């Protein structure tokens, strides 16, 4: 059977980037060219592999990470980047093998007066390691006095909502992102390109 890419790419809602979703894809035929040839994706950037060679490769498993961020932040979903998203939300490794796919989702993910459902981690003390996921919601201590679960001065809830309104400039508009990654072990290959 064909790999269930539609479940990922056509999901009604995407995850918040701080709580980014990972879907394991396995035991199926992947036709990557159908993704790469699509006029839907404004970003389709592979690292450590060329898109036109994917259909010729077999992997143990494939993984699809997905989430929403601002247009201006899509550039952070790449090896070697810094900023609030790369540092505190979703971190690719410096030498990455995989593909980053993104498309404007203003028609789905903005709302008149604002869609506030999509969040990002604004406050964190240190950077994420590659592929780390932090879903904690402890009150963030910004001074020397402990917060003890109470918000206030120097005591901040660590997540913030994007304000996605349809009239936003493109850099402030929501983008849906899928990062494909590939796994090769001393195990049977379960995801190959079409025969």
């Amino acid at each position: 059977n064909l790999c269930p890419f539609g479940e990922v790419f056509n999901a009604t809602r995407f995850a918040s980037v701080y709580a980014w979703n990972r879907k394991r894809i396995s035991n199926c035929v992947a036709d990557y060219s159908v993704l790469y040839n699509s006029a839907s994706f404004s970003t389709f950037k592979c690292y450590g592999v060329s898109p036109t060679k994917l259909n010729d490769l077999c992997f143990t498993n494939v993984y699809a990470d997905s989430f929403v961020i601002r247009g201006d932040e899509v550039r952070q979903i790449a090896p070697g980047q810094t900023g609030k998203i790369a540092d505190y939300n979703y971190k690719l490794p410096d030498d990455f093998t995989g593909c980053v796919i993104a498309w404007n989702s203003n028609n789905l993910d903005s709302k008149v007066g604002g869609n506030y459902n999509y969040l990002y981690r604004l406050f964190r003390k240190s950077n994420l390691k590659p592929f780390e996921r932090d879903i904690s919601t402890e009150i963030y201590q910004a001074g020397s006095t402990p917060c003890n679960g109470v918000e206030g001065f120097n005591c901040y809830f660590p997540l913030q909502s994007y304000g996605f309104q349809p009239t936003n400039g493109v850099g402030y508009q929501p983008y849906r992102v899928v990062v494909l990654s590939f796994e090769l072990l001393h195990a049977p290959a379960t995801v190959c390109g079409p025969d």
């Epitope: 810094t82 540092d87 910004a142 001074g143 120097n154 400039g169 402030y172």
Partner: single-chain antibody, 222 residues
């Protein structure tokens, strides 16, 4: 809570300075910390930022020449300023940067003298005590509610009034209000008081490039 800048002075072009910002009541290493400067008679210009996790970013006007850094054991922020130019002349402010919630803590500034988009309307306004005063800030694209307002009294550091376009900063008098979403934003002072004669700045939050300020509206007597 205070930020105390030092290290400024009078120098010729080509020289170097190091600014220090000693913090108390906020922890430099746990915060976004920015440097913002203001040339004499001009508006605010964001210079650099350092993240809690260590990332640094710079205005194009200073890239390659300035370096922001910190010493956690001294709770101190630094700005190393090399290859200084006449146009780097300004007061340099240390600020604690809350991003979506504006720049809420400002130092008093240190003066550097080197010597051999958001549009506010009007640029100048004359008013009387008790007047209702409104100032408008217009963005070049839709920015939702990503706007802050600041007041800067003559000789003083700016003070945060409003963030998220309409949220009153804690401790700020209720006669200040902000409205707007999208491209057009207004600050209203419901009954102007003698202490309210100042210059007001809007700021586009989480902007690209970072730290976009309007050019300021000066509210003056009569």
């Amino acid at each position: 809570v205070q930020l105390v800048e030092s290290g400024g002075g009078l120098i010729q072009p080509g020289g170097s300075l190091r600014l220090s910002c000693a913090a108390s009541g906020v922890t430099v290493s746990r915060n976004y910390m920015s440097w913002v400067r203001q040339a004499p008679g001009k508006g605010l210009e964001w210079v650099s930022i350092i993240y809690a996790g260590g990332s640094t970013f710079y205005a194009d006007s200073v890239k390659g020449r300035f370096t922001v850094s910190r010493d956690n054991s001294k709770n101190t922020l630094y700005l190393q300023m090399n290859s200084l130019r006449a146009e780097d002349t300004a007061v340099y402010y240390c600020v604690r940067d809350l991003q979506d919630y504006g720049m809420d803590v400002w130092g008093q500034g240190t003066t550097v003298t080197v010597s051999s988009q958001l549009t506010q309307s009007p640029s100048f306004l004359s008013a009387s005590v008790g007047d209702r005063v409104t100032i408008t800030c217009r963005a070049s694209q839709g920015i939702s509610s990503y706007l802050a307002w600041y007041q800067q009294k003559p000789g003083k550091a700016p003070k945060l009034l409003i963030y998220a376009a309409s949220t009153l900063q804690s401790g700020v008098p209720s006669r200040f209000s902000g409205r707007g979403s999208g491209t057009e934003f207004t600050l209203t002072i419901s009954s102007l008081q003698p202490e309210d004669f100042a210059t007001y700045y809007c700021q586009q939050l989480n902007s690209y490039p970072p730290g976009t300020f309007g050019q300021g509206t000066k509210v003056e007597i009569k």
